[PDB]
Amino acid sequence: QVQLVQSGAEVKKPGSSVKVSCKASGYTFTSYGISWVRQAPGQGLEWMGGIIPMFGTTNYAQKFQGRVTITADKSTSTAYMELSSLRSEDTAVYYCARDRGDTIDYWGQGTLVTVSSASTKGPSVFPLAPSSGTAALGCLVKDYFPEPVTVSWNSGALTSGVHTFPAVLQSSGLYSLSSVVTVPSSSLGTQTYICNVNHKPSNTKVDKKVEP
Amino acid sequence: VQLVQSGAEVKKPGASVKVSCKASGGTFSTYGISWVRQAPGQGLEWMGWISPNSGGTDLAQKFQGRVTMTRDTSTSTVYMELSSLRSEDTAVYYCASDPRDDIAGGYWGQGTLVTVSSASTKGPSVFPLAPSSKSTTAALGCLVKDYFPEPVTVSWNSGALTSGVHTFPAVLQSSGLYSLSSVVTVPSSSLGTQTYICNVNHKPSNTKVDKKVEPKSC
Amino acid sequence: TNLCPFGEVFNATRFASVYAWNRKRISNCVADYSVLYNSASFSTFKCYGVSPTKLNDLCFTNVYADSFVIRGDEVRQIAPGQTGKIADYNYKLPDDFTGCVIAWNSNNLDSKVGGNYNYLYRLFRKSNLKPFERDISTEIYQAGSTPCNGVEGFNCYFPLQSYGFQPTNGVGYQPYRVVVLSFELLHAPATVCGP
Amino acid sequence: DIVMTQSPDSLAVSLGERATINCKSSQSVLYSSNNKNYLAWYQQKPGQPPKLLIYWASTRESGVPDRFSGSGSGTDFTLTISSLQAEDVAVYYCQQYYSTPPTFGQGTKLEIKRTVAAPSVFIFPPSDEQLKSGTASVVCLLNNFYPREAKVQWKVDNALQSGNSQESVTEQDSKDSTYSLSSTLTLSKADYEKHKVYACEVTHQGLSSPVTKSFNRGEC
Amino acid sequence: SDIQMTQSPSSLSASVGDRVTITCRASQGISNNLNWYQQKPGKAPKLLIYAASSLESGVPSRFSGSGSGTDFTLTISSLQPEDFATYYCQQGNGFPLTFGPGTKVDIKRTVAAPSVFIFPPSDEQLKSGTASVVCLLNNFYPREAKVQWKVDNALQSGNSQESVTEQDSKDSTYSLSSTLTLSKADYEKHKVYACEVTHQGLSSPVTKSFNR
Ligand SMILES: *[C@@H]1O[C@H](CO)[C@@H](O)[C@H](O)[C@H]1NC(C)=O
């Protein structure tokens, strides 16, 4: 019945500070410790720090001093992890977790923290075209800062063979993503194919056609 | 290093009592603080345990639904609530220390006595007792009747007479009121030498009455 | 030939608790132990298995440095074959120890106004610590015969307790920083020597 | 549910003698890991909360005299006082903290034993101010007797009274090691108006025969 | 000096009903202070086994841990469809807390060669901003693959952002996307772009290319 709820995802400019909150419930607070670990996109788990609410003692990782400060509010059953002077390397999802001594038995939802120099910008989708068994086509979105982005193709009708990739961040650039689909070559000129892209943060839907 | 509990109070059936146990001169968090209740004229009955520095409780089955142990907001105290009070809940409640902690020697707190009874707060009626067919040393005293709630305190000659005085424990009457009698043995030579008065005091009702006992001719 | 960063552990701005005693690995350097013995800044400088005079002109393959803070009364327990709440539960030393122990007073650094309750120590364990073992478990201890699945209750308490470390404390209850050097020579080239 | 049963329920020991209080638990109180009996002893004088004197069934709490001593193992435990004094006259409980919940004994009330003492009986008629009130009550007094065992029965006009007398005994005096008892007979003033002679027949061991102190309604 | 944790193998592939055994090693001895965690993509880690030997509440009995000092092994009695995820080991014997690199587990499949395609940039971006050539692999079971991006007879490794999908839920095949980024003025330097791919299911390497 142990359950930990973390704060919402936040976007910060480089050099600023972030404060991730974590409210624990379903168990006796102050009887267990609480820890923080972050996971960079496509990387392992890196321990941030650990604090015991019984005595308020805080211990941080090797090189996070002057940057991280972890506090606990016993009355509200809430632990706050704060990281300041944030840079682009620190962008990751931070996990709150009930910390026993030699183990961690309950983990929180996590809170994504994105710190990049650019600001929100609508995506620019560019159509892919096949030429010269089955064939492959698709679309390509680029120059969008917020990570959430969706594709639906023929309004949900085209669902077999479609492969939407994970987004990758270009060098000093906004995220980039490509969606593809495999379709028989004999049906290429008969049926129309359109990719419907909806970027909720920019609130801009874009449809683009594909053809040789 | 000692534990000071809250003041004694009285309540009606179905009410709620909240006893505060403050720990002075340090904290008992190393082994916690337990609650033990003692019915008047009965044994010791454990009730539960609590951690003052962190929180969290552990309760017995017979009280699980009624007892509510609370950590302090500050001042390093401990609280305890009891709801749906029955007449059997009338007892003295102590906050005990664990026998095996040497940080503070095994010492409990002054027990907050709570009394649950349908009878309301009432003052005592005091009647003198006359010395006569007696002695070898004549014995006299006073009678207090129909008083609630306990405790009561009696003294003789405003505390001057302290030897040979016997104050008896009260008894609850079917009307829900206590009544006792306190006596004292004085030499039969001093009946006309020195007068005697009994000073009974009922702190709950805040009533102080002095009764002048006069010996009878026979 | 670079010297050993011993002022890196002895002048380490922060120290650790005994239940989580920090361990440093020192190698590829020359260490002058005669400077530390005659420093007159350490209240206790006891060595076991090694003569401190002959220690300087000697070589080892790898030397460990364990650092933590205890009470003054508990400095006696940081020694081979000792008994107590520290040696049994916080930090144990082997019977065949070949390293020194160095302790000194640290009231100004580890005790401030209103007390310094940030140093902890182990109070309960189901078994004694093995030599050079560490245990940072905050599992509630089963002091009685009734089990507890990680929930506080009667006969089940938090195993960690904070030191007082008040400025106007007694010497035996005063904060004392202690560093234990371990001299280990395994199947490797000796790399920590003296002049 | 570990029941603690002490023997005996009440003990009487002379001054300077030794007092032995037995205590038997429902099951063994030693643990396999540490061979320590999780048994404790408590003293509770009638005025204030209890005071711990023995824990782990042998080790004494600091600040108590060497008279008290913890002994026993397993499920049998005995508390022993070398020389009984007047100050350590109280009820003693044995309590175990081996299992949850911890349970105490029923208690052993310890009293000083002295020679037999006869009680000087007295009788007090109801006061005039009480007679002016709704009801009246008569007071029979027993004073300075060691064996608390004493039956008193009110007799009103040679008729045995019962169900209306409430006995009451004070605590043992520290100086003379004696008790005192007061039987209180309560009835309506109209019922008190009808009958003439009111007496309390007192029976005690130190009394060679039942001593009867009586009075008549029309007296002073 | 901290303590590092290593795992083996880096990536394992088995199927339902098989017996999978993973290993974990530490720099210094940690006694019984190792824990195993299971993380699935998009979700938080779960404690599988604490103290390297005891089972945690809510974990099936097929999971079993063992080891002491510096060598520990985690074994599964029989693999299940819900057991395919990434596994970590951590040390809880000292500070700072450190984890292992990780061990991904995917379901086994017959070796399948990747269908490779290549896409040119459309004219719509060339007006706004130079876009990249997109060469995608599709439906190959072993994720192990090297996307070689070439121009003329040389091999340029300046920029090749590889984006890979997770193992497909239906056919259990991966899909890779790589985008060679150059500028429009750079796009006229050679005007012939060849995509080269090496894979285990290919008898000989396969090159896809388009001109102008
Ligand atoms: C710590 O610093 C002091 C001066 O700040 C120096 O005298 C002392 O030797 C240092 N400790 C070492 C080097 O072990």
Residue numbers in the entry:
A (entry chain H): 1 to 52, 52A, 53 to 82, 82A, 82B, 82C, 83 to 128, 134 to 213
B (entry chain B): 2 to 52, 52A, 53 to 82, 82A, 82B, 82C, 83 to 100, 100A, ...
C (entry chain E): 333 to 527
D (entry chain A): 1 to 27, 27A, 27B, 27C, 27D, 27E, 27F, 28 to 214
E (entry chain L): 0 to 211
From the paper:
Consequently, mAbs targeting the Spike (S) protein of SARS-CoV-2 have been a focus for the development of biomedical countermeasures against COVID-19. Following standard biopanning protocols against the RBD of SARS-CoV-2, 20 human mAb binders with moderate affinities that range from 10-6 to 10-8 M were selected.
Epitope binning experiments showed that these mAbs target two main sites on the RBD, with one of these bins overlapping with the ACE2 binding site. Cryo-EM structures of Fab-SARS-CoV-2 S complexes at a global resolution of ~6–7 Å confirmed that mAbs 324, 298, and 80 bind overlapping epitopes. To gain insight into the binding of mAbs targeting the other bin, we obtained the cryo-EM structure of Fab 46 in complex with the RBD at a global resolution of 4.0 Å, and the crystal structure of Fabs 298 and 52 as a ternary complex with the RBD at 2.95 Å resolution. In addition, RBM Phe486 is contacted by 11 Fab 298 residues burying ~170 Å2 (24% of the total buried surface area on RBD) and hence is central to the antibody–antigen interaction.
